[PDB]
Amino acid sequence: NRAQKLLHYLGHVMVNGPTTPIPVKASPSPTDPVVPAVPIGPPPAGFRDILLREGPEGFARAVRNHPGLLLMDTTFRDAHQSLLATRVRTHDLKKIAPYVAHNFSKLFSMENWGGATFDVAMRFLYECPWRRLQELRELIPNIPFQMLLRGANAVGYTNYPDNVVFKFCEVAKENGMDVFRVFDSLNYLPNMLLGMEAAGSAGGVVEAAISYTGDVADPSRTKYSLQYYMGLAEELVRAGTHILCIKDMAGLLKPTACTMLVSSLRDRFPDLPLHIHTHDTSGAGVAAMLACAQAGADVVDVAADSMSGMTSQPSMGALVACTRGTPLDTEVPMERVFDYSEYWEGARGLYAAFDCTATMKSGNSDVYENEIPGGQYTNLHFQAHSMGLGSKFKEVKKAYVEANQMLGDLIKVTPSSKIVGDLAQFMVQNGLSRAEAEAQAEELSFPRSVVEFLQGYIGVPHGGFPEPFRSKVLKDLPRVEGRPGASLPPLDLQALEKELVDRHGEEVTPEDVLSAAMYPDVFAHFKDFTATFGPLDSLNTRLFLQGPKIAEEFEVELERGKTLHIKALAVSDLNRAGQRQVFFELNGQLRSILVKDTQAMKEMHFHPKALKDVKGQIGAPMPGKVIDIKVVAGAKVAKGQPLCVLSAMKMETVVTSPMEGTVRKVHVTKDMTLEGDDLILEIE
Amino acid sequence: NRAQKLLHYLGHVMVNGPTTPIPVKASPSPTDPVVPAVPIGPPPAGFRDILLREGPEGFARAVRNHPGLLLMDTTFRDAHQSLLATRVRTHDLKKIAPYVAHNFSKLFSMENWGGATFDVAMRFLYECPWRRLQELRELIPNIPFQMLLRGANAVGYTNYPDNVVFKFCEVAKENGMDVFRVFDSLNYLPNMLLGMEAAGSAGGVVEAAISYTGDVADPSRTKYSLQYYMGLAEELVRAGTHILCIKDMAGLLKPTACTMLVSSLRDRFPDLPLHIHTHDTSGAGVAAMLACAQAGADVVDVAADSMSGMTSQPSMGALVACTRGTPLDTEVPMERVFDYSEYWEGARGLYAAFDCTATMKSGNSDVYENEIPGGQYTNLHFQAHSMGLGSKFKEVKKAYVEANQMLGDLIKVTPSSKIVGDLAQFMVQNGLSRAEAEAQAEELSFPRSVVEFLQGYIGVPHGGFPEPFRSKVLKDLPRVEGRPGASLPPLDLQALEKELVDRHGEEVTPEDVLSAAMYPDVFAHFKDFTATFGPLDSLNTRLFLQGPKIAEEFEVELERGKTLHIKALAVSDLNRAGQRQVFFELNGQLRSILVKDTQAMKEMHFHPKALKDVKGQIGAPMPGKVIDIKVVAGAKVAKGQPLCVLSAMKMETVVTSPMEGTVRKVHVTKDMTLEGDDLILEIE
Amino acid sequence: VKDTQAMKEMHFHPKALKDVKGQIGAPMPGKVIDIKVVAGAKVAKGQPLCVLSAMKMETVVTSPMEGTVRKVHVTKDMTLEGDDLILEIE
Ligand SMILES: *C(=O)CCCC[C@@H]1SC[C@@H]2NC(=O)N[C@@H]21
Ligand SMILES: *C(=O)CCCC[C@@H]1SC[C@@H]2NC(=O)N[C@@H]21
Structure with a gap:
C-alpha cells in the first residue's frame, strides 16, 4: 500500500519538476534500448568456481599458469564514474545481467563496486548498495567481483579507525564479495599495510595498486624514479600479496614506459600475475596496452566499445581484433561484443540529460600538462555547474596545474585530486595568481580541507608538506603525525545502533548501522525521503527523471x-x-x-492597516495621496486641530485630531497613495 | 437515470459554444436580481373571482361600471420582442409570481403568451409552452391572463384549417385560460369572424383588435379615413363582442387624433369598455395615451419601468405619477412598482449578450416613413446579422419603404410585415433599384412567402393590390380565390396521434399533437433534442447559456x-x-x-496511393520532383520502357512500365514533387 | 518614447567593498550555518567567524584583523553568495 506515496512522488515530479539537480537541460531519448536474447541454460561456470574450490593463492596460480591474456570489463563502475556522473540505477543493469552471465564467462573478473557508489546511492540517487549488490551476485554466480577500496578510509575521505574498517570488510566478505583492491592516495606505507592486513583478515584474493604518475622514460625528472616504484613493489611483494596491480588514472603510459617497466618487474617476479588499469583519455591507451600485453601483462582493464574512448577505458573491439592473429588470442566472440556495445549505447541515449559530450567532444592531448584524473572530470564539471562556474570551466582546468604545484608534484589521486580541485576553485573564484596566494597564505581563508591535509589527517606526502605555505596556513593549528588511523581513537559500534533504532526504524541490522556511522546525516535524509515516498527504484529511468x-x-x-x-x-x-x-x-x-x-504566494504590499477597535488608532478616511501632514512624530496636538491633509480630484478630507495627546509615529511621511483605513499615525 | 444526460450537456457546453446562436458577443453579468419580499397569506381577490361568479358580459359590465382606470401589463409578452429576441426562460419568470399575485390585485390582466412565443419556445429555447403556462396558473389564482391570437392562422403564418383553429382555441380555453384577443394582419372580415366564432365556441371573454395606420387627422391621408374605421368598428360591433381594442404597432397616435377617435367611438357606443395597445417608439406615446385616456378610455397597456421606452410600452411610473391628482385615480402604491423595476433592471443584464442598445442607442424618429412594427425590429436585426447582412442593416430598412410601395399602403403586423422584410432582404441582397425591379419582375425568382401572399393564402386586402406585378410573379401559378380557410381542405389529426406514438411517442399529449400539427419539423427536432439531453429549465440562465x-x-x-x-x-x-x-x-x-x-474537422486530401494488390498499378519508387513524362495517358507502353524521371536531391530513378500494354491515365502534372509509392499511372 | x-529595483544583501579592509565578504556562495561571534564582541586575529556549506565545501571565515565586531551583516539562515559583506570591522 505504497502506491499512494509513489503517486505523490509522480505528481511532485509533474508539478515541482525533477528533484535531482540537472547540470544541463536535455530530454531523454523516447526509444528504449534493446536487450539481446539469452540462452535458457544456466550461465557457464567462469573462474568463480575456482575460488569456491581452490584457495585464493591456488586461484592466482591457476590464472598465472594460464596461457593468454585475461580481460576486465570495467564498464559498470569506472566508465559510469568517468564518462557520466555515475547516476545509473540498477534496473537497466539487471536488464542485461543475464546476458553477461550467459555470454561473458571467459572474463577474468568483474568490477561492480565503487568508491562513490555509497555517496551516489545516498545523496542524489536513492538506493541501497548492499541490496542491488545482492541481486547482481544472485544473477552472476560464476564471475568473481572486484571492489574498490582505499588504504585508511574505507569509502570516506579522512583516515578512519581500524576496527570499523575491519568490520566493514568482514561484512562485505560475508555478503559474498570476491576480489578486493586496496590502494592509497599518496601510497602511504602504514595505510597500505593496514589495508593489506584487513583484506587478509577478510580472507580472499588480495591485490594492491601502485599509483602511476609521470613518465619513467624521462631521465631528466626522477622525482619518482623507476627505482622508487621498484622498491615500492619490493615491499609490496614481501608483504605477501596475491597479485600486483597497476592503475593509470590519467592514461599517462607510453608503450615504451609500458614495456620497460613491465620487463623491470617481471624479470624478478616470474610467477607474479599482472593487473593493469588505465583511462583512455588521450586516445593512445591502446598502443600502451598492446605493448604491455606483449611485454608480459596478465590482466588489463578495458571498457565496452560504446562506453569506451573519451576518458574511459579503451574498447573491446580494438584489442579483440588486434590479437586475432596474434598468439595473445583473446578468444572471445565478436557478436557478444556488438550486442554489449549496442545495448550500452542505447542505455546511454536514455541518460542524455547530462552527458558531458556537449562540453568536451573528443579526448585531447591536454592531459600531459593538466593531469586531470579520468574518472572525476565530468563530476568536477558538474560540481562547477552546481557552483555556477561552468562558464569559466576552461579557466577552471587552467588553474589545476598551479593548484597542484602549490603543494608540489603530489600523487594526485581522488582525495588529493579533490583537494587540488578545491584549491583551483578557490583561487579562480578569487582570481589571484601564485604569488598572491603564497605571500598571503595566512591571509586567505582556505577551507577546512586545506588545513585538514596540511595537518596530516590523511597522511604525510612522500615529498613532504610545503613548509612555508603550511607554516603560514596552519600556524597555531595542531599537527598530528604518525598513522592517523593509529592516532584516531576507536569508536563504539553498539550504542549508535540503539540511538538510530530509537530515532527511526524498528529493526536491527549491521548494514545500516555501519552506513550511518560512516555517514549519519545523508543516511537520515535518505530514510526520511524513502519513508515519505515508500520504496523506490522499481521505476524506469525516464519515469524516475521526468515522470509519466x-x-x-x-x-x-x-x-x-x-x-x-x-x-x-x-x-x-x-x-x-x-x-x-x-x-x-x-x-x-x-x-x-x-x-x-x-x-x-509572492508577498507584496501588505501595508499596515489601522484597527478601529482602538479608537486612538487613526485610519485614512479616503484613499489617495497625502499633500502634507501638519504634525511631526512626538508632537503634542489638541482636539479638533488639523494634523493631516488627504488629496483627491474633487474632495479634500482634512484629518481631525481624535483627542488630546502626542503622536507616536507618522507612518505616512509625504505623497504616497493611501487606501481607505490606512495607518497614517497613532495619537494618544 | 437522468443526471448523465444533463452532465453530458454541461460537458458539451464547456467544450463547444452555446447551442443557440449568439447575435452579439458578450457575457452575462455576475449579478443576481433582488427578489422583493412576499407575504405568507393567500393572494387577495382580483378579478378571477368576479368572472368566476359572473359571465363574461357580467364581468365586462362590472369593469365598465368601475370609476377610474385599469391597467394592462405586457412585460411578459410584448417587452420580450420589443427589447430582446424573446429569449427569456421560464426559470427566471417563476421568481416574482408570488410577489405580484400578492402585491398586485388592482391590476386588470397580464399578457404572457403571444404570437411569436411558441416558434421560439421549441426552436431556439427548448421548452414546452403548455408546461410553463400550467406552472403559472397555480402561482396566480388571482388575476386573469390574456391570449394574443390571430384570426385565420392560429399561431402559424398561413391560414390554418378552421377545425384546427377551433379545437386549438377549445383546448386553450380548457387549459384554464381566461381572456382572449382576436386579431388579423389585414381587415379581412371573415378572418375576424372565424376568430371570434372560435372564441365563442371556446366560451369566455372575447376581445377583437383593430390595427391603426397613417393619420386620421390628416385630410391628405385618405386611404384609411375615419369613416373607413367607423365602418370597420360598426361591422365588428354588429358581429357582437365583449370588449373592443385598438392596436398601434408602431406608436403613431398623436393626442388629437386618438382623442377625436375616442370621442367618435364612445359617442355611438357609450357602454363598451375601451382598450388601447401602443408601442412607445416615437417618444410621444405617453402624452397621447394619457390625453385620449382622459378623453374616454377605460383600459391601458403599460410595460415595466426598466422594460419601457425605446419601442416597448410606457412605464408604470409615469402613468402612476400623472394619474395622481386626477379623477381617474389609478391608486397604486409605487414602492412595489419601484422594487419590481429594480428586479427587472437586475434581470436585464443576464440576457445582455443580445440587445437593441448595441445597435439602436436611442429612440429614433422617422418611424412614420418606415412604419416598422415595434415587435419586429429586434428580430429583423438579428435575422439580418445571422444572414450576414447585419453590417448593412441601415440599407435594409432603407429598401423597406420601396417594398411598401411594391405592395402599396397596407396594414402589416405579423405576416405581411415579415413578408415586406424578406422582400427587402432580397432587394438589398441583389443590390438592385426599385424601378427596374418593378420592370424585370417576371423572370426574377422571389421568396416563397411573397408567392404565397400574391396567391392569396391570407385574404383580400381592403384596398386590393396591383395586378401586373402579380401576373409577372405568379404567372402560371394556381391562384387562391375566396376565403383560403373555407377553400382549405379540412384534415384529421387522429392519425397524427398514432404516427407520433409509434414513431417516438409513449407519453404524447393532445397539446403535443397540436404542436406537431403546427410546426411538425421543429416539434420533432425539439422532442429528439430534449430526449437526448433530458429536461431543461431546471438551472440558472447564465448556467444554461454560459455554463458553470x-x-x-x-x-x-x-x-x-x-x-x-x-x-x-x-x-x-x-x-x-x-x-x-x-x-x-x-x-x-x-x-x-x-x-x-x-x-x-481535419480535411486533408492526398495524391492517390498505388495499391500493391493491383499489379497493374505503378507506384513512385522515390519521392522527389518530376522532371519529365515520356508516356501520355491512353498510350501503348513497352515492357521495361522508360516513362518518367525522378530526382529529388541526389538519386535519379527512371520509372519503366514493368508490363506490356497500354496505360489508362497518368496522375502527373509534370511539375509537382510527389512522394514515393504514389499512383502515378496504371497498367491494364 | x-x-x-x-519598474526596476535593487534589493537583498549588498556587496563587500574591497578598499575597506575592515569589511569582510563571503569567500564562497553557500548557506549560513553558524556565526561564531555576536555583534559587539571582541574578535582575535585568525579567529573563526562563520561557517559556510553548500554541497561538500566546508569553509570557516577567519578574522582578517583583531578588533571588536560592530554589526552582523551576515544575519542568519539566509543564503549568501561570494563577495557579500558578512562582518564589518572599524
Ligand atoms: C560529492 O558529490 C562530490 C563528488 C566528487 C567527489 C567523488 S568521491 C569519490 C570520487 N573521487 C573524486 O576525486 N571525486 C569523486
Ligand atoms: C423567428 O423566430 C420568429 C420571430 C420572428 C417573426 C415574429 S412573428 C410576429 C412578428 N411579426 C414579424 O413580422 N416578425 C415577428
Whole structure:
C-alpha cells in the first residue's frame, strides 16, 4: 500500500519538476534500448568456481599458469564514474545481467563496486548498495567481483579507525564479495599495510595498486624514479600479496614506459600475475596496452566499445581484433561484443540529460600538462555547474596545474585530486595568481580541507608538506603525525545502533548501522525521503527523471508479488491554495491527489492597516495621496486641530485630531497613495 | 437515470459554444436580481373571482361600471420582442409570481403568451409552452391572463384549417385560460369572424383588435379615413363582442387624433369598455395615451419601468405619477412598482449578450416613413446579422419603404410585415433599384412567402393590390380565390396521434399533437433534442447559456426534494479523435464524462496511393520532383520502357512500365514533387 | 518614447567593498550555518567567524584583523553568495 506515496512522488515530479539537480537541460531519448536474447541454460561456470574450490593463492596460480591474456570489463563502475556522473540505477543493469552471465564467462573478473557508489546511492540517487549488490551476485554466480577500496578510509575521505574498517570488510566478505583492491592516495606505507592486513583478515584474493604518475622514460625528472616504484613493489611483494596491480588514472603510459617497466618487474617476479588499469583519455591507451600485453601483462582493464574512448577505458573491439592473429588470442566472440556495445549505447541515449559530450567532444592531448584524473572530470564539471562556474570551466582546468604545484608534484589521486580541485576553485573564484596566494597564505581563508591535509589527517606526502605555505596556513593549528588511523581513537559500534533504532526504524541490522556511522546525516535524509515516498527504484529511468506523461499507460512493478499500472490523466490547475490536483487512473480505478507547488504566494504590499477597535488608532478616511501632514512624530496636538491633509480630484478630507495627546509615529511621511483605513499615525 | 444526460450537456457546453446562436458577443453579468419580499397569506381577490361568479358580459359590465382606470401589463409578452429576441426562460419568470399575485390585485390582466412565443419556445429555447403556462396558473389564482391570437392562422403564418383553429382555441380555453384577443394582419372580415366564432365556441371573454395606420387627422391621408374605421368598428360591433381594442404597432397616435377617435367611438357606443395597445417608439406615446385616456378610455397597456421606452410600452411610473391628482385615480402604491423595476433592471443584464442598445442607442424618429412594427425590429436585426447582412442593416430598412410601395399602403403586423422584410432582404441582397425591379419582375425568382401572399393564402386586402406585378410573379401559378380557410381542405389529426406514438411517442399529449400539427419539423427536432439531453429549465440562465465556470460548486434542482450540489474540476484534451474528458463533483462523488468535440474537422486530401494488390498499378519508387513524362495517358507502353524521371536531391530513378500494354491515365502534372509509392499511372 | 510600465529595483544583501579592509565578504556562495561571534564582541586575529556549506565545501571565515565586531551583516539562515559583506570591522 505504497502506491499512494509513489503517486505523490509522480505528481511532485509533474508539478515541482525533477528533484535531482540537472547540470544541463536535455530530454531523454523516447526509444528504449534493446536487450539481446539469452540462452535458457544456466550461465557457464567462469573462474568463480575456482575460488569456491581452490584457495585464493591456488586461484592466482591457476590464472598465472594460464596461457593468454585475461580481460576486465570495467564498464559498470569506472566508465559510469568517468564518462557520466555515475547516476545509473540498477534496473537497466539487471536488464542485461543475464546476458553477461550467459555470454561473458571467459572474463577474468568483474568490477561492480565503487568508491562513490555509497555517496551516489545516498545523496542524489536513492538506493541501497548492499541490496542491488545482492541481486547482481544472485544473477552472476560464476564471475568473481572486484571492489574498490582505499588504504585508511574505507569509502570516506579522512583516515578512519581500524576496527570499523575491519568490520566493514568482514561484512562485505560475508555478503559474498570476491576480489578486493586496496590502494592509497599518496601510497602511504602504514595505510597500505593496514589495508593489506584487513583484506587478509577478510580472507580472499588480495591485490594492491601502485599509483602511476609521470613518465619513467624521462631521465631528466626522477622525482619518482623507476627505482622508487621498484622498491615500492619490493615491499609490496614481501608483504605477501596475491597479485600486483597497476592503475593509470590519467592514461599517462607510453608503450615504451609500458614495456620497460613491465620487463623491470617481471624479470624478478616470474610467477607474479599482472593487473593493469588505465583511462583512455588521450586516445593512445591502446598502443600502451598492446605493448604491455606483449611485454608480459596478465590482466588489463578495458571498457565496452560504446562506453569506451573519451576518458574511459579503451574498447573491446580494438584489442579483440588486434590479437586475432596474434598468439595473445583473446578468444572471445565478436557478436557478444556488438550486442554489449549496442545495448550500452542505447542505455546511454536514455541518460542524455547530462552527458558531458556537449562540453568536451573528443579526448585531447591536454592531459600531459593538466593531469586531470579520468574518472572525476565530468563530476568536477558538474560540481562547477552546481557552483555556477561552468562558464569559466576552461579557466577552471587552467588553474589545476598551479593548484597542484602549490603543494608540489603530489600523487594526485581522488582525495588529493579533490583537494587540488578545491584549491583551483578557490583561487579562480578569487582570481589571484601564485604569488598572491603564497605571500598571503595566512591571509586567505582556505577551507577546512586545506588545513585538514596540511595537518596530516590523511597522511604525510612522500615529498613532504610545503613548509612555508603550511607554516603560514596552519600556524597555531595542531599537527598530528604518525598513522592517523593509529592516532584516531576507536569508536563504539553498539550504542549508535540503539540511538538510530530509537530515532527511526524498528529493526536491527549491521548494514545500516555501519552506513550511518560512516555517514549519519545523508543516511537520515535518505530514510526520511524513502519513508515519505515508500520504496523506490522499481521505476524506469525516464519515469524516475521526468515522470509519466499525459494519457500514457505504464505498468509499475511495485514488488515481485504484484505489478500494477498507472494512467496519468490530467494536470488539473493551480488552486488558490498552493496545492494542485492531479488525475490518475490505476488498473481499474480513478484517483486524484493534491500536490504542493513551490510558488506559495509572492508577498507584496501588505501595508499596515489601522484597527478601529482602538479608537486612538487613526485610519485614512479616503484613499489617495497625502499633500502634507501638519504634525511631526512626538508632537503634542489638541482636539479638533488639523494634523493631516488627504488629496483627491474633487474632495479634500482634512484629518481631525481624535483627542488630546502626542503622536507616536507618522507612518505616512509625504505623497504616497493611501487606501481607505490606512495607518497614517497613532495619537494618544 | 437522468443526471448523465444533463452532465453530458454541461460537458458539451464547456467544450463547444452555446447551442443557440449568439447575435452579439458578450457575457452575462455576475449579478443576481433582488427578489422583493412576499407575504405568507393567500393572494387577495382580483378579478378571477368576479368572472368566476359572473359571465363574461357580467364581468365586462362590472369593469365598465368601475370609476377610474385599469391597467394592462405586457412585460411578459410584448417587452420580450420589443427589447430582446424573446429569449427569456421560464426559470427566471417563476421568481416574482408570488410577489405580484400578492402585491398586485388592482391590476386588470397580464399578457404572457403571444404570437411569436411558441416558434421560439421549441426552436431556439427548448421548452414546452403548455408546461410553463400550467406552472403559472397555480402561482396566480388571482388575476386573469390574456391570449394574443390571430384570426385565420392560429399561431402559424398561413391560414390554418378552421377545425384546427377551433379545437386549438377549445383546448386553450380548457387549459384554464381566461381572456382572449382576436386579431388579423389585414381587415379581412371573415378572418375576424372565424376568430371570434372560435372564441365563442371556446366560451369566455372575447376581445377583437383593430390595427391603426397613417393619420386620421390628416385630410391628405385618405386611404384609411375615419369613416373607413367607423365602418370597420360598426361591422365588428354588429358581429357582437365583449370588449373592443385598438392596436398601434408602431406608436403613431398623436393626442388629437386618438382623442377625436375616442370621442367618435364612445359617442355611438357609450357602454363598451375601451382598450388601447401602443408601442412607445416615437417618444410621444405617453402624452397621447394619457390625453385620449382622459378623453374616454377605460383600459391601458403599460410595460415595466426598466422594460419601457425605446419601442416597448410606457412605464408604470409615469402613468402612476400623472394619474395622481386626477379623477381617474389609478391608486397604486409605487414602492412595489419601484422594487419590481429594480428586479427587472437586475434581470436585464443576464440576457445582455443580445440587445437593441448595441445597435439602436436611442429612440429614433422617422418611424412614420418606415412604419416598422415595434415587435419586429429586434428580430429583423438579428435575422439580418445571422444572414450576414447585419453590417448593412441601415440599407435594409432603407429598401423597406420601396417594398411598401411594391405592395402599396397596407396594414402589416405579423405576416405581411415579415413578408415586406424578406422582400427587402432580397432587394438589398441583389443590390438592385426599385424601378427596374418593378420592370424585370417576371423572370426574377422571389421568396416563397411573397408567392404565397400574391396567391392569396391570407385574404383580400381592403384596398386590393396591383395586378401586373402579380401576373409577372405568379404567372402560371394556381391562384387562391375566396376565403383560403373555407377553400382549405379540412384534415384529421387522429392519425397524427398514432404516427407520433409509434414513431417516438409513449407519453404524447393532445397539446403535443397540436404542436406537431403546427410546426411538425421543429416539434420533432425539439422532442429528439430534449430526449437526448433530458429536461431543461431546471438551472440558472447564465448556467444554461454560459455554463458553470471552472473550479466552482453550484446547486441544481430536479424537483421539490431532488436538489444537487455540483462542482467541476477541469477538462482533458483531444485524446485521439477530438474527444474530451471532464471531471465533475457530485455531493460527494467524482464523475468523469466524455464529450465529442466538433471543432476537429481535419480535411486533408492526398495524391492517390498505388495499391500493391493491383499489379497493374505503378507506384513512385522515390519521392522527389518530376522532371519529365515520356508516356501520355491512353498510350501503348513497352515492357521495361522508360516513362518518367525522378530526382529529388541526389538519386535519379527512371520509372519503366514493368508490363506490356497500354496505360489508362497518368496522375502527373509534370511539375509537382510527389512522394514515393504514389499512383502515378496504371497498367491494364 | 520613454515607457512607463518599466519598474526596476535593487534589493537583498549588498556587496563587500574591497578598499575597506575592515569589511569582510563571503569567500564562497553557500548557506549560513553558524556565526561564531555576536555583534559587539571582541574578535582575535585568525579567529573563526562563520561557517559556510553548500554541497561538500566546508569553509570557516577567519578574522582578517583583531578588533571588536560592530554589526552582523551576515544575519542568519539566509543564503549568501561570494563577495557579500558578512562582518564589518572599524
Ligand atoms: C560529492 O558529490 C562530490 C563528488 C566528487 C567527489 C567523488 S568521491 C569519490 C570520487 N573521487 C573524486 O576525486 N571525486 C569523486
Ligand atoms: C423567428 O423566430 C420568429 C420571430 C420572428 C417573426 C415574429 S412573428 C410576429 C412578428 N411579426 C414579424 O413580422 N416578425 C415577428
